[PDB]
Amino acid sequence: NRPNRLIVDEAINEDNSVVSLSQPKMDELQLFRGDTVLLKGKKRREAVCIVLSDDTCSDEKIRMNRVVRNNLRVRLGDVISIQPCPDVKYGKRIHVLPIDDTVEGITGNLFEVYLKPYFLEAYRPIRKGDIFLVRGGMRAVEFKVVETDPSPYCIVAPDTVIHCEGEPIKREDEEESLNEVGYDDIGGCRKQLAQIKEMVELPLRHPALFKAIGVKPPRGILLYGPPGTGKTLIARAVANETGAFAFLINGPEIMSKLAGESESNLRKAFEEAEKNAPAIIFIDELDAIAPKREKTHGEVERRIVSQLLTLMDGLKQRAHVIVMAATNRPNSIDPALRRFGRFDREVDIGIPDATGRLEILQIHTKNMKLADDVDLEQVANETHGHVGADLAALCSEAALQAIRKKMDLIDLEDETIDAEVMNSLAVTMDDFRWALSQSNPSALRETVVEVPQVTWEDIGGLEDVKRELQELVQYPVEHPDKFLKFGMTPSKGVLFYGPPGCGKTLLAKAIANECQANFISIKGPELLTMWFGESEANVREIFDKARQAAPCVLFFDELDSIAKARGGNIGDGGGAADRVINQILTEMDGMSTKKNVFIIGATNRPDIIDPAILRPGRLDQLIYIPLPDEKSRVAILKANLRKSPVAKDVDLEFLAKMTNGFSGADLTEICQRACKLAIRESIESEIRRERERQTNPSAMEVEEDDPVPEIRRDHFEEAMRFARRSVSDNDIRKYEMFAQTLQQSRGFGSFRFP
Amino acid sequence: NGPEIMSKLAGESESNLRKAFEEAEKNAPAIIFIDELDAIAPKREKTHGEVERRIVSQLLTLMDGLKQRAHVIVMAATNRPNSIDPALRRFGRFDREVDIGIPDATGRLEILQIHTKNMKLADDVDLEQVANETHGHVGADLAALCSEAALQAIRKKMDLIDLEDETIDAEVMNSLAVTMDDFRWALSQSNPSALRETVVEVPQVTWEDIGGLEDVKRELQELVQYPVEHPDKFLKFGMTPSKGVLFYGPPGCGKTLLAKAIANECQANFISIKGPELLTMWFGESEANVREIFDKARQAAPCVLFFDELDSIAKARGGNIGDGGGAADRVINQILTEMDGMSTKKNVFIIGATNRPDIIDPAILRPGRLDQLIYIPLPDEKSRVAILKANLRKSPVAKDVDLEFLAKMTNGFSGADLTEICQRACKLAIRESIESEIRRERERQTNPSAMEVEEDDPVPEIRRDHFEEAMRFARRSVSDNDIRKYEMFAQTLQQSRGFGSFRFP
Amino acid sequence: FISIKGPELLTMWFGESEANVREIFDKARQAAPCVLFFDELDSIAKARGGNIGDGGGAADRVINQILTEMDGMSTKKNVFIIGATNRPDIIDPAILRPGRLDQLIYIPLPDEKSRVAILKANLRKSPVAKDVDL
Amino acid sequence: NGPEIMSKLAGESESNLRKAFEEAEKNAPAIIFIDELDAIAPKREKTHGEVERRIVSQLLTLMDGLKQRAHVIVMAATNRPNSIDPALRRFGRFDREVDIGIPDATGRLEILQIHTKNMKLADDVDLEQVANET
């Protein structure tokens, strides 16, 4: 709300040299003409030059040369703050050096070329780091600042010598700085960027308060996640968005030198980060410098580990230094670094979801000349198991395909037509469809943690189940004051039981959606793989994973599978207990309802389940999920068929009226068979037409009466011919009697108080 | 500092040690502290190399040579004692030990008071509710939690003024405070460090949380209280004091409560070992952890060491039919070995608890071992009244409701059942309160009433019709064939004591 | 086409080496489109009795890894899996579920034309007479 | 050549690597070929010593630093991918793979034609029967 906080707008003149004003401001201000001016924007990036040729357009705005969109700033919506400061001294000469272009063709002097006539009445009032493309020719060619006789921004006088020693420099060498990567090159990690910014911006940006407050800052931050998820760029981004100076370290480089070079290098990094402050250090591949003490064979290894422990313990100086570092798992580094005063904060970066993949694709494809029929959102949904680097690869392959696909033969004839032909090249959806099949992703076995889309209307009945689940999961995330004011303790899990294919995973996903909560799934083969392998210590990792990501629904499907692998209930003589469910017990007894983790289990044989887990302070509730009734079948059929081209004559009300005792899985089967038939007929018609035409000596024929555009009723009728049930009525009777037993256990008449 | 000693060349390290011991001899009487001694001297095995074993030997030498009447004491810090070379744990070397351990709620309250004395709190902060809501936290975790609460309070509102660089920041900080909602947000955003550590403390459970079982109380008192307070009697009559007992009976009748209560009356520590811990030693062939449990109890005596679900390994392998193997197993055999190797001078009392007394190895019910058996039955009237009150003494209840009659119509109910009743009634009350709140504030949003302040708070209590709707779902978990089984496992052993009257001449 | 035979599965069973399934599936990934054929899929179920056998139910460490691997690949990469058995009654029913094999085709004993064509295919490398009529 | 890099003293080896990468930067656009890379860099476990892990780290460094728009490609040869340190199989390092595999009968016929073109064969040699018998 400061007086001179005004918006930035377009430019009217070509070069960066003349600045504008807004005269309604200078009454309270002291804006005069001269040499320099203090102008304030983002990241302390500035371009100080002459000012005051304005009043062409309306007030409460600051007009700024075109190049100042990435000079001094990033985009529009910023604000320019205004304070002159004239009367600067005179040094002999300053800032003369181009970078990319005029290296082409003739060399000359690179100041005597075309930049000759600019200084007239404007004898070089400018600042460092200034970049504006200018020429006496096309008026668009780079120019950079290198030399500093005095470093502050100075003034020029004639009869001087300059320094253009160095042949210009290009794009890659200064690319990270030129990119000035900010929080726009980073996709798929919005939450965790929020967390990091919250951690750091106060200690790094407002440090004098952080002094006057007394609270202690972070010492060590550890970033987790698989390879290819943008962790270095994060560090650069935070450093540049905070003004802070960054020092970057690389593990295998520290370990590629002699035992004395390595430790010197560490010490010097920590030193340089103490001198320049407030700083940031980044360590990549820390599992290289410091793995599990066991694996360490040698004496230089353990010794540089000890050096790093020492150097971490000695950062207590009120010196505004933060050390960030990157690994894959936390069980991959020596555990002595994970200690109060050392790396005590952690962030999991994880695999993206479809919105994140869409962000990454938008970020990459902004210099590609796409084509009109590309729905990158269909792609982002067709990229399961991909991390960001995998999508960079996929874009690359699509584009290079589009190139070699047609213009190979012209590409061969060496000439300059290549240039215009590239200026006429595009990328199609068939390119992405070919690349996407030619890909081998990297995180198909990683654990997926996300919010699901499944909603209550993909289900149609089971209304009291819905209400129950809501009382159990929704009310304590939203209304905990009630649970205090009545002093009640909230349940932490439940067990679903009933027959197969009646929709137990859908309900868990739906109640996770309503609370916008993460969902994790553990399946039967995972439990049997821990049994067969005597590896039941992986349960603890599952529960820790859910801890980080709370609030979460942690779902255990096929919980009765180890009991079936060893007979059923007769089986051995061993009773019900086993090593994997015993660890699940141990872990549920060791977590609090303060952290909001809800556990659902699911079974189809409730009679062979260890009864210890159905005890108080454990699952302790039982809900029956039956075979669907009419409305449920109608809604299930619609949910199945809401992506195929269907007719209108067909009525699913009657299909539901004649499908009683059918599991949803069956109805799904019906739909798949009907579409199977439609496909077969369409393909046959296409074959046999185009042939019958090839035979015909009709030199001309364009009449495509597209045979099959839909799915008609006789498809469905032929399908129902193969209709099948998978759930008998002796089974229904078994579940009904496992419900009524436990409903008679609740045998009490009416109880009226006196 | 260990890692500093190990971050130098093989000759710098030993010089450094020698010079410390020297400087502490010159200035006297002194004290040396060694932090992270597992770094300089771990288990001889792990040591791979020749500078390692060599600085270990240097430290052994330097300890043996402190005999000078020179007033030097060496203190040092580890996590476990099995983490250092055992040759340092020797007469003349490190021969005294202290366990510092995890705090309890009074300690956490002390730590919170100590930290928060320069924070500008706010009036509605009961740090004692916090200290009770911080299970598994050590002191550094509470420093962290305070920090997070305060920095939250800061960024919560004054971020936008914090941004406009000027000196108003200073006065605004001079006007900043911390609320209980800050601690409530931080406390949920915490991941504590000692949730798997063994808890050793005195419990609050007292005899009135229980209502009946008076002869059980008297018995337990004769067994635990009298020798802690009246050992002169036990000498003057030359009698030997029992060292343990076994509780048996049905589930949910209160066997852990009595053990906690008799630990309270003697103001003695309590330790609990549960069924999944024993099954984890079985499955894992790791039964050498029993010795650590018993040592733990040794340090902390006088103590009640409680073994729950002692019959669990016998059930995992069938019941009594099961295999052809008899009753013995590797984990209970180590418990035997350890009970036979401790004295009644150190005051450690062992209680076990089971619900299937028929499948328990009979070796452990022999003299010089548990050797007593007490029955814990289903509760009678007064017991149910007291159990209901103990359950409901934290919720806002009505006065019209009478729990006398609830107890009069609940016969054959385990305390666990009655607990279920109470939880369901509060469940219903909560549901109605939330619905009313929703639907009012909506019906008002619809109404074009630009002004309305009348909050007739709908549900402030727990009334009888809640309880009645709950009792509709009342359920028992203990049949009468089971009651008959326990009754016949009591009368058998009461007939074994079959003797008429025996009058001396 | 790739073929995996019965002694290979029994060699992973006897040897507790069932982590070689993943290499098979990766091999098929590189070479797609491919038919990956599993012959004698019921062999571990016969080595341990038939259906009476032990008290253990139908599950085993090698077919469980085959399940894990089929649930982790996409139809975008065009890998089709065929199995073959002669005792369909002792096969773990988890693998005949949706998103898995889930179709069953009967292959019977050959009829007339089938035998004629089979005889000719057998004899199309030997010097035969003309008088003989197949 | 791997075994040659490992047949020298710890300082000759790393100099040699650096000089190869240098010479391939000077002359460009170039190609480097590394044969028997399982010799320079096997599974981190098998590595016993300190010159071993150190030349592995040197090669990782030298791969990460090829970003110069310098038109250098590094090709290398192994038997299996589980035979090299997995840190080389990473974005920016060796990220593309090709399986060369065993030939089929058309390929064997090609190889035989390629070899036998300076042999003075005889009229009754059907190398295609051979290619099917190999």
Query: Closest by alpha carbon to B315, among B344, B277, B355, B255?
Result: B355
- The answer to whether A55 and A12 have CB atoms below 8 angstroms apart is no
- The answer to whether B234 and B267 have CB atoms below 8 angstroms apart is no
Let me know if B115 is exposed, middle or buried by CB neighbors in 10 A (0-12, 13-18, 19+): middle
Element (H, E) at A136: none
Peptide bond into D81 cis (omega under 30): no
User: Which residues of chain B have a CB within 8 Å of the CB of A306?
Assistant: 3-4, 6-7, 39
Query: Closest by alpha carbon to B1, among A296, A319, A341?
Result: A341
Query: Closest by alpha carbon to A253, among D62, D18, D5?
Result: D62
C-alpha distance from residue A469 to each of A154, A243, A511, A591 (Å): 71, 49, 7, 21
Tokens of B203: 């419990």
Measured CA to CA, the distance from residue A4 to residue A1 in angstroms comes to 8
- Please provide the DSSP assignment of B272-335 as one string: EE-HHHHHHHHHTT--TTHHHHHHHHHHT-SEEEEE--TTHHHHHS-SSSSSSS-S--HHHHHH
Distance linking the first and last C-alpha atoms of chain A: 69
The residues, any chain, with a CB within 8 Å of residue A289's CB and separated by 6 or more, are A251, A254, A255, A283, A304, A305, A308
Does B255 belong to an annotated binding site? Answer: yes
- The answer to whether A326 and A286 have CB atoms below 8 angstroms apart is yes
Tokens of C73: 């690949």
User: Which residues of chain A have a CB within 8 Å of the CB of C56?
Assistant: 565-567, 571
Q: Count the neighbouring beta carbons within 10 Å of the beta carbon of residue D114.
A: 8
Tokens of A514: 């309503």
User: Which residues of chain C have a CB within 8 Å of the CB of A567?
Assistant: 55-57
Contact flag for A and D (3+ C-beta pairs < 8 Å): yes
- The answer to whether C100 and C66 have CB atoms below 8 angstroms apart is no
Residue C64 exposure: Cα atoms within 13 Å on the Cβ side: 23
Measured CA to CA, the distance from residue B195 to residue B136 in angstroms comes to 4
Measured CA to CA, the distance from residue C108 to residue C101 in angstroms comes to 20
Cβ of B6 and A487 within 8 Å? no
User: Which residues of chain A have a CB within 8 Å of the CB of B280?
Assistant: 582-583, 586
Element (H, E) at A247: strand A245-250
Measured CA to CA, the distance from residue B40 to residue B5 in angstroms comes to 8
Tokens of B497: 């004591």
Of D48, D58, D87, the CB nearest to A256: D58
Alpha-carbon torsion (A546, A551, A552, A553), positive or negative: positive
Of C67, C72, C78, the CB nearest to A445: C72
Of A250, A255, A297, the CB nearest to D54: A255
The residues, any chain, with a CB within 8 Å of residue A728's CB and separated by 6 or more, are none
**Annotated binding-site residue numbers of D:** 79, 115
Query: Closest by alpha carbon to A458, among A513, A496, A407?
Result: A513
A226 Cβ under 8 Å from any chain D Cβ: no
DSSP 8-state class, residue C77: S
- The answer to whether D84 and D43 have CB atoms below 8 angstroms apart is yes
What region does A554 belong to: left with phi over 0, alpha with psi -120 to 50, or beta? beta
A574 Cβ under 8 Å from any chain C Cβ: no
User: Which residues of chain A have a CB within 8 Å of the CB of B164?
Assistant: 1-2
The residues, any chain, with a CB within 8 Å of residue C107's CB and separated by 6 or more, are none
Query: Closest by alpha carbon to A726, among C101, C96, C66?
Result: C96
Q: Count the neighbouring beta carbons within 10 Å of the beta carbon of residue B341.
A: 9
Cβ of B429 and A2 within 8 Å? no
Size of the A and C interface in Cβ pairs below 8 Å? 43
Neighboring chains of C (3 or more beta-carbon pairs < 8 A): A
D48 Cβ under 8 Å from any chain A Cβ: yes
Of A227, A253, A298, the CB nearest to D50: A298
Measured CA to CA, the distance from residue B392 to residue B386 in angstroms comes to 10
* Maximum Cα interatomic distance, chain B, rounded to a whole number of Å: 104
> Beta partners for B254?
none
Residue C50 exposure: Cα atoms within 13 Å on the Cβ side: 4
User: Which residues of chain A have a CB within 8 Å of the CB of D63?
Assistant: none
SS3 content of chain B, % helix, strand, coil (to 5): 50, 10, 40
What residue of A is the nearest CA neighbor of D90?
A227
Peptide bond into A125 cis (omega under 30): no
Cβ of A532 and C64 within 8 Å? yes
Measured CA to CA, the distance from residue B296 to residue B99 in angstroms comes to 9
Chosen for mutation from C76, C100, C104 (greatest number of chain A CBs closer than 10 Å) is C76
A5 Cβ under 8 Å from any chain B Cβ: no
D93 Cβ under 8 Å from any chain A Cβ: no
Experimental technique of record: cryo-EM
User: Which residues of chain A have a CB within 8 Å of the CB of C76?
Assistant: 382, 436-437
- Please provide the DSSP assignment of B167-224 as one string: THHHHHHTT--B-HHHHHHHHHT---S-SSSPP-B-----GGGS---HHHHHHHIIII
Cβ of A202 and B118 within 8 Å? no
> Beta partners for A221?
A324, A345
DSSP 8-state class, residue C4: E
Q: Count the neighbouring beta carbons within 10 Å of the beta carbon of residue A208.
A: 9
Torsion angle in degrees (nearest 10) through CA of A143, A148, A154, A159: -80
Cβ of C64 and A665 within 8 Å? no
- The answer to whether B77 and B37 have CB atoms below 8 angstroms apart is yes
Measured CA to CA, the distance from residue A717 to residue A670 in angstroms comes to 10
Does A170 belong to an annotated binding site? Answer: no
Q: Where are the alpha helices (DSSP H) in B447-496?
A: 464-471, 480-495
Measured CA to CA, the distance from residue C87 to residue C40 in angstroms comes to 9
Measured CA to CA, the distance from residue A105 to residue A730 in angstroms comes to 90
What residue of D is the nearest CA neighbor of A301?
D50
Measured CA to CA, the distance from residue D134 to residue D131 in angstroms comes to 5
- The answer to whether B72 and B66 have CB atoms below 8 angstroms apart is yes
Measured CA to CA, the distance from residue A465 to residue A453 in angstroms comes to 19
Q: Are strands A81-83 and A38-40 parallel, antiparallel or unpaired?
A: antiparallel
Three-state DSSP class for residue B452: coil
For A267-369, list the strands marked E by DSSP: 279-284, 321-326, 343-348
Q: For A107, phi and psi rounded to 5 degrees?
A: -90, -65
Does A320 belong to an annotated binding site? Answer: no
User: Which residues of chain D have a CB within 8 Å of the CB of A389?
Assistant: 91
Of A440, A532, A668, the CB nearest to C61: A532
Measured CA to CA, the distance from residue A86 to residue C81 in angstroms comes to 80
Q: For A66, phi and psi rounded to 5 degrees?
A: -50, -55
Query: Closest by alpha carbon to A389, among A427, A354, A351?
Result: A351
Cβ of A668 and C72 within 8 Å? no
Tokens of A421: 């032909």
The angle formed by the CA atoms of residues B295, B300 and B305, to the nearest 5 degrees, is 70
Does A400 belong to an annotated binding site? Answer: no
Query: Closest by alpha carbon to B297, among B279, B271, B318?
Result: B271
Distance, C-alpha B208 to centroid of its chain = 21
- The answer to whether A265 and A254 have CB atoms below 8 angstroms apart is yes
User: Which residues of chain A have a CB within 8 Å of the CB of C64?
Assistant: 525, 528-529, 532
Cβ of B396 and A486 within 8 Å? yes
Measured CA to CA, the distance from residue A356 to residue A330 in angstroms comes to 24
DSSP 8-state class, residue B19: H
User: Which residues of chain A have a CB within 8 Å of the CB of B42?
Assistant: none
Cβ of C57 and A665 within 8 Å? no
Of B283, B471, B474, the CB nearest to A579: B283
Q: Which of residues 62-91 of C touch A (CB under 8 A)?
A: 64-65, 67-68, 71-74, 76-78
Of A436, A444, A566, the CB nearest to C56: A566
Q: Count the neighbouring beta carbons within 10 Å of the beta carbon of residue D104.
A: 9
A753 Cβ under 8 Å from any chain B Cβ: yes
Measured CA to CA, the distance from residue B248 to residue B308 in angstroms comes to 11
**Annotated binding-site residue numbers of D for ATP:** 79, 115
B405 Cβ under 8 Å from any chain A Cβ: yes
What residue of C is the nearest CA neighbor of A572?
C55
C-alpha distance from residue B299 to each of A165, B200, B302 (Å): 78, 11, 9
